[PDB]
Design a protein around this ligand. Structure first.
Ligand SMILES: N[C@@H](CCCC[NH3+])C(=O)O
Ligand SMILES: N[C@@H](CCCC[NH3+])C(=O)O
Ligand SMILES: [Mg+2]
Ligand SMILES: [Mg+2]
Ligand SMILES: [Mg+2]
Ligand SMILES: [Mg+2]
Ligand SMILES: [Mg+2]
Ligand SMILES: [Mg+2]
Ligand SMILES: [Mg+2]
Lengths: 295, 296
């Protein structure tokens, strides 16, 4: 009971300071039509931190409704640094038809490994849908160790793998060498192919917001062990993959989506804001080397 | 600028049966007042700000204000958020409910740029007319307020008067006060309270003072009075407890020590925080034995 394949950490478009729900649905339809296997509403890339709890819930509902009647799954963002709120989001996602949840390691409060284990156990015990852990220490200030990930995978029936955003291919080897049944998911676009070629089973991508067909193809080639073709795409995408992090994600990806005419306004919620003019121009220049699908 | 400086405590938040123990909270604050503390910080990191509800966060600020009323002790209310709209809401609440100023941690998790940090804190500072202390703790937030950004905020915004630094970076503390000597640099790292004060820092926002308020207030007051020999003496004596209070993530050790000292009833955290390991529980207990812990 897993959610794998090519997946997108959806941006959240704003219009006049509110979630633009029509644009959100339209962007999801564009992901579906370009080979994406699942969408992740309200992850880091979707500005989870600055949505209200009601908006967070609305974006999950829009993703569920938009994916009905399709093969595309909804892996709902449900993380929180307070376990009671992470349980509440997990339950909401279950009750409102998500296929599974993503759940980021608690940020700012730096729980111990024992606390992370208890956090995730509480979340997994609250629902009967798949739970994907999400490790991104550069943002949270903590790491879910390999031992803790493996213990959670083995001890909790619905915890099925981890999204790694840690720049640590050693850890990816460690994870799958000791627990080959888990689903390791790339959370770092530039190294999608290395993670997949070591037996990772999907990506939760920032770049796919802009280039969903390319990330889709990369992932599906790799899962088929067509590594030459997957690597070729990974290699081709390196420049855009890296420029999308020239400032904190999702500042560059929303900039690119705006430059591509895919969102109406380059609008963030504070404390996120527009990139520098110089970075804005760098992103624009890198984009010229890629074919960007429209609607 | 109006300022809040001196010896300050990042209050722990005691829980009882899963709720804030409001009587214990007030009792702990009165104990801080009686041991020379200059201000208290309700609902900082040490107060488990992340896992209190917005209502509990507000109640703890109100208890601090009421308990300090009529004493000279100030309330520098924890008001940070990684969402600017919520940081503004907490700032306004603290202003409207009688806090003397606010602490406001740099946004965690979403990694704003320096421009975003500037706009975040400008919005906060413009929303109130009480002092605002920035708070940099990159190991927990994932971002750093640069020296340049702190100094610009200090110069551009009337209310922003300094920063609590929890960054292990005495070079930055020199940089800050060499280029902007008018700001109030506040130590947010107990083990290096004395180095920060001796370079012209003007107070501490302390974890250790929860347990040893008299020692931390004395350390700070000796230093402000330029008795560096005596401030260093206490800083040195406190190193072992200062370090053991971070053997696991703060506030796990300090709540453990407060419980071991009989100062709180229950060793209760909100998940994802939890009890320390049995080894670290014993280590904290052992280190505490070398210090004289004031009662109530
Ligand atoms: N700003 C808070 C609340 C987010 C609520 C919706 N995801 C946080 O980052 O945890
Ligand atoms: N857990 C959320 C909400 C805290 C609300 C009370 N301080 C955060 O850390 O931002
Ligand atoms: Mg809205
Ligand atoms: Mg999440
Ligand atoms: Mg790490
Ligand atoms: Mg890397
Ligand atoms: Mg095939
Ligand atoms: Mg091949
Ligand atoms: Mg704060």
């Amino acid at each position: 009971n897993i959610i794998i394949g090519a997946m997108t950490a959806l941006i959240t478009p704003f219009k006049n300071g509110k979630v633009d729900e029509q644009s959100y649905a339209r962007l999801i339809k564009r992901q579906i039509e370009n080979g994406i296997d699942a969408v992740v509403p309200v992850g880091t890339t979707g500005e989870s931190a600055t949505l209200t709890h009601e908006e967070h819930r609305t974006c999950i509902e829009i993703a569920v409704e938009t994916c009905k009647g399709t093969k595309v799954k909804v892996l709902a963002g449900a993380g929180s640094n307070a376990t009671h709120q992470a349980v509440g989001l997990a339950k909401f996602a279950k009750e409102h038809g998500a296929d599974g949840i993503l759940s980021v390691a608690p940020y700012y409060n730096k729980p111990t490994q024992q606390g992370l284990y208890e956090h995730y156990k509480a979340i997994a015990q609250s629902v009967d849908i798949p739970v994907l852990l999400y490790n991104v220490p550069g943002r949270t200030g903590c790491e879910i160790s390999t031992d803790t990930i493996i213990k959670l995978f083995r001890d909790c029936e619905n915890i099925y793998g981890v999204k790694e955003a840690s720049g640590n291919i050693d850890k990816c080897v460690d994870l799958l060498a000791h627990e080959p049944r888990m689903m390791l998911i790339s959370g770092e676009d530039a190294i999608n192919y290395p993670i997949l070629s070591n037996g990772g089973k999907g990506v939760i991508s920032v770049t796919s917001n802009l280039l969903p067909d390319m990330i889709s193809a990369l992932t599906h080639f790799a899962l088929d062990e067509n590594y030459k073709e997957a690597k070729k795409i990974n290699d081709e995408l390196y420049n855009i993959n890296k420029i999308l992090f020239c400032e904190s994600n999702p500042i560059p990806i929303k900039t690119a989506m705006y430059l591509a005419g895919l969102i109406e306004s380059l609008e963030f919620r504070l404390p996120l804001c527009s990139p520098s003019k110089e970075n804005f121009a760098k992103i624009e220049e890198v984009m010229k080397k890629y074919k960007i699908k429209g609607f």
